[PDB]
Amino acid sequence: ATFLGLSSKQEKALVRLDKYLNLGEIAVSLVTDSATSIKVEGRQGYYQVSYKQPHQLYRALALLSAALRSGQDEVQIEEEAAYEDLAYMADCSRNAVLNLSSAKKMIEVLALMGYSTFELYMEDTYEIENQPYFGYFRGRYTVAELQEIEDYAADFDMSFVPCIQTLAHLSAFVKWGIKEVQELRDVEDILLIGEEKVYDLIEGMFQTMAHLHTRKINIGMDEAHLVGLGRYLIKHGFQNRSLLMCQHLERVLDIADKYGFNCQMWSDMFFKLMPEETRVYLDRLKERVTLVYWDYYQDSEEKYNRNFQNHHKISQDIAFAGGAWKWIGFTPHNHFSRLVAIEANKACRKNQVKEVIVTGWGDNGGETSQFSVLPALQIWAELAYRNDLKKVSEHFLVSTGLDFDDFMKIDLANLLPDLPDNLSGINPNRYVLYQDVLCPLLEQHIRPEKDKQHFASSAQQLGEISKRAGEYAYIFETQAQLNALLALKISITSGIQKAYRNGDKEHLSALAEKDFPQLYQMVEDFSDQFSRQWQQENKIFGLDTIDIRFGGLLKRIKRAQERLEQFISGQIDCVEELEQEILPFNDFYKDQGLTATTANQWHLIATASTIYTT
Amino acid sequence: ATFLGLSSKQEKALVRLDKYLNLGEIAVSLVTDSATSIKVEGRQGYYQVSYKQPHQLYRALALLSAALRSGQDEVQIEEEAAYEDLAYMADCSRNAVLNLSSAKKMIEVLALMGYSTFELYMEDTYEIENQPYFGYFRGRYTVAELQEIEDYAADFDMSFVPCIQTLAHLSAFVKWGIKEVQELRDVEDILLIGEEKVYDLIEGMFQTMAHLHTRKINIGMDEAHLVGLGRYLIKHGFQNRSLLMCQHLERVLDIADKYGFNCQMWSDMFFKLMPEETRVYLDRLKERVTLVYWDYYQDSEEKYNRNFQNHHKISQDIAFAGGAWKWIGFTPHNHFSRLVAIEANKACRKNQVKEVIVTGWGDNGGETSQFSVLPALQIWAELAYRNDLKKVSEHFLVSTGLDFDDFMKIDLANLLPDLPDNLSGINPNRYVLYQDVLCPLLEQHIRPEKDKQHFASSAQQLGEISKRAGEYAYIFETQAQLNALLALKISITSGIQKAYRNGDKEHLSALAEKDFPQLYQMVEDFSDQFSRQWQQENKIFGLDTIDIRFGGLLKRIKRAQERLEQFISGQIDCVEELEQEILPFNDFYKDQGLTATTANQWHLIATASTIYTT
């Protein structure tokens, strides 16, 4: 294609996006117009594209690319976006630090989808001058790395917002047994309010971020239960948590003001607005921040509406944070993400929300692909720009080169048949993998025939998708292997429970001789595939935790084989592990009558023994 | 030997102890006499043994056995014990649950040494009716198991004291995400004071123990910082921790009273005695318990004396708990144990202490042999009965069949040359083993030539001891393997740091091709040996955590080899792990100027990444 009206900046962006767009030999003219977000109009090889915000050029060109692929000559498209700002926040704090190549790829995709803003969540994973332990061995970003990411987003007229922590959720930092870190602590993952060395640290955070162009930052500042109750209590006695939060927030805002930053934060601290001089304190501080209402779970518009109404009692500056579900193990939940997005979008529109942030957390090790939730991201963009999903497949094909319904199957290891679609966090991908074989703590939450058949079918389906997934094949290969592994692991685990119960030493010998070596090899092969996926997407730091978890699983599989062999041979009279009555693992979904559950802490899945505690 | 004056009970005990005692063809007559603890007198094949307490018969016979082996015909021995009760407490809560065969062996040894009492520390590792999650998959003792252990001790006229927890340190139990467990929690490892379901649980504890003959129990009741500050605070608001401790202790004592128990507990809660109506509360509760002053660390009598003086301001019923150091990894510290015992014994005698408890904790996984501290146990017995160590070797030979100085070398993996002897917890046995190879977090605390040479020498020494250690050979074989492993691991880890620094790809290739496979095999072999040791001593439950830790280490060793291979081949341009500046791990011994340190949490040694946190 050729263009009239481009800046040199837009020219360079279109060179970068050439591989996504399939415009062919057409002529496009550009206009800037505030009347509607995007307009694309033309026929017979000549089209005019208009955009309100500069970044919207790239979604407009994706819309044109799609309309022409669908066989249109005549094009007449107009979109009015619901949200002035639409952001994606990737988690870089849960061991997976997005590498620069992958950050650049994500920015390109987000540009084509229509996002205005890219965000990275970094607890301790950026460098601070004079804090050598902050981000130590974590793959922390350097200033130059953050600048490179910010500048790449700016190349597409997209903004950048760092999401940091100024009070709590600094667990990887506060673990270091050095005076200059320990003196900063209250208790658990929480920094010490009122400590001047803590305000020195926080000033360091802002000094790092001041090297960027952006002057918008998310400071966190959610309200942890133990704030004020550790070393704070020992130094000062008991204080109202809300008063401490106020004192701390004022200090943080005074620092942000010094460096020219405007702060966003979670709204939780202000729920009380929705002692005399403390209410006054909250009321003054609320004027200085943008509040973000976060909700990843609710299945009905009206539930969101009630919360928006309550927030608007105290401020009109309320942003919304929704969820692209990628924090429940190795496998995302784009399906659940879609369900909640549909409802949240209704509520955000009704309550005149101007900014939506889609969050991509990575809870407990960052085991899910950084690109696992592209479908959810497209869904939110379609909802924002069109208020429907009628063109989600056509637009997704531009964004990714793949079929949307194929990509949605990435979820399969979580999609057990007949689960209610509105229940979140159900993650057998993860807990079926990591549970022990001899002492399977999740065994009563598994349907050993039904679930096994689901995983086996899923592996076959994903094997076929991977062959047509191009540069994303690697993520589907990981999922195909996982599903195959889960099916065999269930067969063996449940098979041992039954053969042992019935004293069937012959079936146990078959398992020991044939199935165990197969399982062991499949786990080794899975670790190798996962390692390829990790290294494509993330810095090397953090893969070590997954090495530990997989290494341990492998050794436990070897133990199970050896213990069974000794029982079969007569070297031992019984396998005491297999004599124990198994109980439910948790009751999270007992009230809903489910067999599956949510279990999202590796150390609790893998063993009942102590492993972190003293 | 033949005997006049034995009961049928003593006859049966002497049959059990026959293999330890080497009395030959002599004649022994017994007398009970309160004038002195033990007297052994005779000549020319005819001896009279007198004892004050029945269990002291067995030490008296060990003294005779030793005197006759030393070549004496004429024997004239008299001992006046300093302590009416001398106890050993084994830890059964840190994943290692002593098996019944090993409990019986330990009781026999303790009988010969002169201990009056055997104790087991069980947080959650006993069965409670109607609490199926309490001790679930932990190897909890059944009532019949505890009875069998108690009855075996009674067979030697020894007492049994269960050591339980009635408030805090129930971390393995409170982890279960089931309403009927979660409703019992305050925060972290602490039960909820004032909750009637918690008093139902505690009554269950006593109902279990009431099946025993003993009516002496250690209830724990140390004073954790967060008592009252979790769900308690949410339900009730902020309360003085001392008042809550009083309220809870009264409830626990009322339950104990119902079942006929007399309670011992740590003295900490009462330090304040050493608001008006709260002081009164403490003063009334102190009359109902025996207080135990615990101290495992102090290197001078006068330090203990000061604490005894302070305790005696509030009660004359003060017991002392000393330490047999076996909670710092895979290797004990009998040497340090001896240093502190000498001083503590002086202070206990000066302050007229009647009961000494020697504790054998197993912090963070129970990795040290249950029989690792026999030397420390003999030391305390000699100090108690003779006030010196002049006969420690002679008496130890009866107790164990081995040389005391040989057995003391079990400590070698902690005995780095030139460490100050009065500094506790220095545990390179553990942190040199578990640190990573690519990201060695403890590297600055290692002297790479000096320490390597120490470990290599130690492996040789222990290899020779193991050949003459009889039925204890297995514990020395574990130590010989560990020391050899540590030496090679240092060579490789430090060798990589230097070869990479200097760009020496050839030396890295040698390491990758030869040394890495050797190390990997040595770790596999060590895990196999450790597993043999574990299964000799403990129930199977809990070995799983060590499988996880070793499995992870193995996988990290494989990663290190693979990453180096890719660097050598040119598949990658650098190994980012090896480009990071290493920092001190901790500053625990910075003020003493040490290079080595204490590091006793596996999850912090093995990785800087998150592994337990969300």
DSSP A251-301: HHHHHHHHHT-EEEEESGGGGGG--HHHHHHHHHHGGGEEEEEE-S----H
CA distance B422 to chain A (A): 22
- Residue of A387, A270, A395, A372 whose CA lies nearest to A323: A372
DSSP A603: H
Residue A133's CATH number: 3.20.20.80
Report the sign of the C-alpha dihedral through residues B317, B323, B327, B328, in that order.
positive
Domain that holds residue A530: 390-614
C-alpha–C-alpha distance, residues A494 and A476, integer Å: 27
The answer to whether B551 contacts A547, with C-beta atoms less than 8 Å apart, is no
Dihedral angle, C-alpha B292, B295, B299, B301, nearest 10 °: -10
Q: Under DSSP, is residue A40 helix (H, G, I), strand (E, B) or coil?
A: strand
C-alpha–C-alpha distance, residues A80 and A39, integer Å: 9
Cα angle at A358 between A357 and A361, to 5 degrees? 120
Q: Name the phi and psi angles at B216, rounded to 5.
A: -120, 130
DSSP B98: B
Residues of chain A in contact with residue B525, where contact means CB-CB under 8 angstroms, are none
**Closest Cβ–Cβ partner in B364, B555, B583 for A136:** B583
The answer to whether B94 contacts A610, with C-beta atoms less than 8 Å apart, is yes
Structure tokens at A306: 């009630």
The answer to whether A176 contacts B586, with C-beta atoms less than 8 Å apart, is yes
CB–CB of B156/B10 below 8 Å?
A: no
Cα angle at A538 between A469 and A479, to 5 degrees? 40
Instruction: Count how many domains chain B has.
Output: 3
CA distance A58 to chain B (A): 35
Tokens 């909640």 sit on residue: A340
Same domain, A153 and A210: yes
The answer to whether B577 contacts A607, with C-beta atoms less than 8 Å apart, is no
Same domain, A25 and A170: no
Structure tokens at A261: 């930053």
Same domain, A412 and A515: yes
| B524 interfaces chain A, CB cutoff of 8 Å | no
- Residue of B52, B17, B8, B61 whose CA lies nearest to B31: B52
DSSP B577: G
Order of strands, sheet of B2-4, starting from the edge strand that comes earlier in the sequence: B2-4, B27-32, B46-51, B38-43, B75-79
Q: What type of residue is B560?
A: A
Same domain, B216 and B276: yes
Q: Where are the alpha helices (DSSP H) in A437-542?
A: 450-466, 473-501, 505-510, 516-537
C-alpha–C-alpha distance, residues B77 and A228, integer Å: 62
Structure tokens at A346: 């209704």
- Strand segments (E) across B92-244: 117-121, 159-163, 185-187, 190-191, 216-218
The angstrom resolution of this structure is: 1.4
Q: Under DSSP, is residue A533 helix (H, G, I), strand (E, B) or coil?
A: helix
Residue A28 pairs in a beta bridge with: A3, A47
Please name the residues in contact with A579: beta carbons below 8 A apart, sequence gap of 6 or more: none
State the pairing for strand pair B46-51/B38-43: antiparallel
The answer to whether B555 contacts A559, with C-beta atoms less than 8 Å apart, is no
| Chain A residue whose CA is closest to B604 | A175
H helix or E strand, kind and range, residue B311: helix B301-312
The answer to whether B586 contacts A559, with C-beta atoms less than 8 Å apart, is no
Same domain, A75 and A188: no
**Closest Cβ–Cβ partner in B225, B555, B601 for A550:** B555
Note the Cα A184 to chain centre separation in Å: 29
Q: Please, which residues 547-566 of chain B have a Cβ atom closer than 8 Å to chain A?
A: 547-556, 559
Residue B259 CB neighbour total at 10 angstroms: 14
**Closest Cβ–Cβ partner in A363, A540, A606 for B614:** A363
Structure tokens at A72: 């249109």
| B585 interfaces chain A, CB cutoff of 8 Å | yes
Please name the residues in contact with B114: beta carbons below 8 A apart, sequence gap of 6 or more: B55, B56, B58, B59, B81, B86, B381, B384, B385
Structure tokens at B314: 């509030």
Residue B342 CB neighbour total at 10 angstroms: 16
* Cα distances (Å, whole numbers) of residue B276 to A19, B83, B240, B445: 80, 37, 13, 51
Q: Where are the alpha helices (DSSP H) in B538-576?
A: 543-569
CB–CB of A390/A561 below 8 Å?
A: no
Tokens 């979904």 sit on residue: A589
C-alpha–C-alpha distance, residues B579 and B438, integer Å: 10
Q: Under DSSP, is residue A424 helix (H, G, I), strand (E, B) or coil?
A: coil
| B604 interfaces chain A, CB cutoff of 8 Å | yes
**Closest Cβ–Cβ partner in B95, B178, B610 for A365:** B610
State the pairing for strand pair A46-51/A38-43: antiparallel
Same domain, A596 and A461: yes
* Cα distances (Å, whole numbers) of residue B136 to A439, A580, A610, B93, B149: 11, 9, 12, 13, 21
Residues of chain B in contact with residue A544, where contact means CB-CB under 8 angstroms, are 436, 438-439, 556, 559, 607, 609
* Cα distances (Å, whole numbers) of residue B423 to A175, B414, B451, B597: 23, 12, 18, 10
Cα angle at B10 between B7 and B16, to 5 degrees? 150
Crossing angle of helices A334-350 and A301-312, rounded to 10°: 50
CB–CB of A591/A422 below 8 Å?
A: no
C-alpha–C-alpha distance, residues B344 and B544, integer Å: 37
* Cα distances (Å, whole numbers) of residue B189 to A443, A613, B120, B171, B334: 26, 10, 20, 5, 30
Q: Name the phi and psi angles at B507, rounded to 5.
A: -65, -40
Last residue of a domain, one of A80, A109, A131: A80
Cβ contacts below 8 Å, chain A against chain B, sum to 202
Same domain, B15 and B34: yes
Cα angle at A27 between A21 and A32, to 5 degrees? 85
Q: Under DSSP, is residue B88 helix (H, G, I), strand (E, B) or coil?
A: strand
Same domain, B285 and B431: no
- Residue of A525, A541, A397, A413 whose CA lies nearest to A472: A397
| A3 interfaces chain B, CB cutoff of 8 Å | no
Residues of chain A in contact with residue B225, where contact means CB-CB under 8 angstroms, are 230, 234
C-alpha–C-alpha distance, residues B207 and B126, integer Å: 11
* Cα distances (Å, whole numbers) of residue A340 to A384, A411, B524: 14, 16, 49
Over the Cα atoms of chain A, what is R_g?
Answer: 26
Same domain, A157 and A73: no
Last residue of a domain, one of A351, A370, A389: A389
Note the Cα A186 to chain centre separation in Å: 28
Terminal alpha carbon distance of chain B: 66
Residue B449's CATH number: 1.20.120.670
H helix or E strand, kind and range, residue B234: helix B231-236
| Chain A residue whose CA is closest to B224 | A230
| B612 interfaces chain A, CB cutoff of 8 Å | yes
C-alpha–C-alpha distance, residues B296 and B321, integer Å: 8
Expressed in percent and rounded to 5, the helix, strand and coil fractions of chain B are: 50, 15, 35
Q: Under DSSP, is residue B79 helix (H, G, I), strand (E, B) or coil?
A: strand
The answer to whether A612 contacts B606, with C-beta atoms less than 8 Å apart, is no
CB–CB of B19/B61 below 8 Å?
A: no
- Residue of A367, A342, A339 whose CA lies nearest to A423: A339
C-alpha–C-alpha distance, residues B92 and A432, integer Å: 30
**Among A130, A137, A190, A240, the residue to mutate for chain B (most B Cβ within 10 A):** A137
Report the sign of the C-alpha dihedral through residues B382, B383, B387, B391, in that order.
positive
The answer to whether B177 contacts A133, with C-beta atoms less than 8 Å apart, is no
Residue A358 pairs in a beta bridge with: A88, A322
Q: Under DSSP, is residue A178 helix (H, G, I), strand (E, B) or coil?
A: coil
Q: Under DSSP, is residue A554 helix (H, G, I), strand (E, B) or coil?
A: helix
C-alpha–C-alpha distance, residues A502 and A427, integer Å: 31
Method: X-ray
C-alpha–C-alpha distance, residues B534 and B445, integer Å: 29
Secondary structure in 3-state letters for A387-418: CCCCCHHHHHHHHHCCCHHHHHHHHHHHCCCC
C-alpha–C-alpha distance, residues B242 and A543, integer Å: 45
CB–CB of B36/B80 below 8 Å?
A: yes
CB–CB of B88/B322 below 8 Å?
A: no
> What does chain B come to in residues?
614
Report the sign of the C-alpha dihedral through residues A557, A562, A568, A571, in that order.
negative
C-alpha–C-alpha distance, residues B224 and B241, integer Å: 9
Residue A556 CB neighbour total at 10 angstroms: 22
Residue B2's CATH number: 3.30.160.230
The answer to whether A365 contacts B436, with C-beta atoms less than 8 Å apart, is no
**Closest Cβ–Cβ partner in B137, B559, B585 for A439:** B137
Q: Please, which residues 302-361 of chain A have a Cβ atom closer than 8 Å to chain B?
A: none
Residue A88 pairs in a beta bridge with: A118, A358
CB–CB of B164/B208 below 8 Å?
A: no
Note the Cα B348 to chain centre separation in Å: 21
C-alpha–C-alpha distance, residues B214 and B120, integer Å: 13
| Chain B residue whose CA is closest to A602 | B612
**Closest Cβ–Cβ partner in B138, B436, B581 for A608:** B138
DSSP A30: E
Same domain, A42 and A162: no
| Chain A residue whose CA is closest to B554 | A551
Q: Under DSSP, is residue A119 helix (H, G, I), strand (E, B) or coil?
A: strand
Same domain, B187 and B332: yes
Same domain, A579 and A538: yes
Residues of chain A in contact with residue B187, where contact means CB-CB under 8 angstroms, are 226
Please name the residues in contact with A281: beta carbons below 8 A apart, sequence gap of 6 or more: A243, A246, A250
**Closest Cβ–Cβ partner in B95, B544, B552 for A548:** B552
DSSP A98: B
> What does chain A come to in residues?
614
| B241 interfaces chain A, CB cutoff of 8 Å | no
C-alpha–C-alpha distance, residues B200 and B203, integer Å: 5
Last residue of a domain, one of B369, B389, B409: B389
Report the sign of the C-alpha dihedral through residues B31, B33, B35, B36, in that order.
positive
DSSP line for B128-147: -TT-TTTTTTTTPBPHHHHH
CB–CB of A144/A125 below 8 Å?
A: no
C-alpha–C-alpha distance, residues B20 and A429, integer Å: 56
Burial class (CB in 10 A: 0-12, 13-18, 19+), A6: middle
Residues of chain A in contact with residue B607, where contact means CB-CB under 8 angstroms, are 544-545, 548
DSSP A538: B
Over the Cα atoms of chain B, what is R_g?
Answer: 26
C-alpha–C-alpha distance, residues A158 and B59, integer Å: 83
